[PDB]
């Protein structure tokens, strides 16, 4: 049972130039490709997906998500930002506050948009907050993860990176200790359902 | 060096395959998994490999009472990580005089996991930050700092983990050190992986 992906989804620049278009034809593919990605989850019953935007441009990423919420919504998706926003845009942060409390008691998919997230500011994050307060003594495994992004949701079972690279590049960290970790050369706006299968396979036989 | 590789991290699983493979029980697995380890330590020393570090798993130091001596005559500073405050007394002095012994070693730093985890490892280096803070500031916590306190951080830094056995999980060995490194999982089994693999492995963090 793969209960939660997270997807690298690089490629859409590499795809662009291969196609002969400009770096925006590629982000518009890539656009595609999430809605095809986020259907396709939300139909075969997984619980969470947690979307890496990887190749500034980050909050041009979230604008453009701000205008599908209401189709999340009526698709009964939970959508949660995770990632240091605080120096976003005050109106842009406005709508995450808005967009995560209109989806929040959603019961389908659990989307979760990393925006300006790193898997050691995660971690550092977490670790800013234990240290404001308890002994040094009693800090232990369960207690760090209490603090990382999205500690409520089942553990990350696999990540997919998309584009050929073979790196983390800083996405979750703590999170995919026990994930399975899938490559493909498949640019990310040309990841479709059979792909997806594709990783979710290599899942299963493990 | 041409393959551009300081640091390579090592996931060493499929002793116990290969054993089954053969016949044969499990220990005899880990018998041509020490051969293999020994093979490898050795092409990294060759080859200009500032850091070496091996993660035994199957999908132990005692006779470091018998290779320490090859060790320290080949200059390389031995390195244990992972929680051994948990170990006999014995053990934990055995450790601490290989390590004492090659400390001033200068060719390749050998990191051998023993009771390692990447989230202990994490949780340790925290609590080197609590005590700090106790002692007397958290909005001054940031990655560097965090990262000063993380096993090896006084490394380069790890730029290509090797899992053999077939398995694609980090399975909780390095995650703080991972962050950027190059990823390589090959089917072959740790006692199989020899110095042409390594070989294929470097080449692919240079051809990538
Ligand atoms: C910068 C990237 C832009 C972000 C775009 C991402 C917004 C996600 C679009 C939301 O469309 C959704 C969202 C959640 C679920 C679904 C969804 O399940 N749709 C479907 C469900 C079933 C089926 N089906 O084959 O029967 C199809 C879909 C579907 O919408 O294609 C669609
Ligand atoms: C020719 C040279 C031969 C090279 C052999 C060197 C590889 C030996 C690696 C030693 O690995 C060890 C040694 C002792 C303990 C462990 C270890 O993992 N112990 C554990 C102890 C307690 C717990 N626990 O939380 O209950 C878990 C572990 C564990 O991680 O499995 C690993
Ligand atoms: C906690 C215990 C640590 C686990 C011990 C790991 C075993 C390490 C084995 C040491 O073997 C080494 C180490 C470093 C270098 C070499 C090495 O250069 N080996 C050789 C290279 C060439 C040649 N040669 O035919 O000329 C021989 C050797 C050789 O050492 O046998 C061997």
Redesign the interface.
């Known amino acids: 049972g793969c209960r939660h992906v997270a997807i690298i989804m690089d490629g859409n620049g590499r795809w662009a130039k291969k196609q002969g278009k400009i770096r925006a034809f590629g982000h518009k593919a890539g656009a595609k490709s999430v809605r095809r990605a986020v259907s396709f989850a939300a139909n075969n019953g997984i619980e969470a997906l947690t979307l890496y935007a990887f190749s500034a441009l980050m909050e041009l990423f979230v604008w453009a998500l701000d205008s599908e919420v209401k189709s999340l919504h009526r698709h009964n998706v939970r959508l949660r930002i995770i990632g240091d926003t605080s120096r976003f845009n005050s109106r842009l942060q406005e709508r995450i506050r808005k967009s995560e409390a209109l989806t929040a008691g959603n019961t389908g998919l659990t989307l979760n948009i990393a925006a300006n997230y790193?898997?050691?500011?995660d971690?550092?994050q977490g670790?800013?907050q234990?240290?404001?307060k308890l002994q040094?003594?009693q800090?232990?495994?369960e207690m760090?993860n209490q603090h990382v992004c999205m500690h409520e949701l089942a553990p990350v079972d696999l990540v997919i990176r998309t584009g050929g690279?073979?790196?983390?590049?800083?996405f979750l960290?703590?999170q995919?200790?026990?994930?399975?970790?899938?490559?493909t050369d498949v640019l990310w706006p040309d990841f479709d359902e059979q792909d997806f299968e594709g990783a979710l396979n290599?899942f299963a036989n493990?």
Do not use: K, M, T
């Open positions: 790193g898997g050691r500011w971690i550092v670790v800013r234990l240290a404001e040094p003594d800090i232990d495994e760090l690279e073979h790196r983390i590049s800083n960290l703590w995919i200790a026990y994930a399975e970790l899938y490559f290599a493990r």
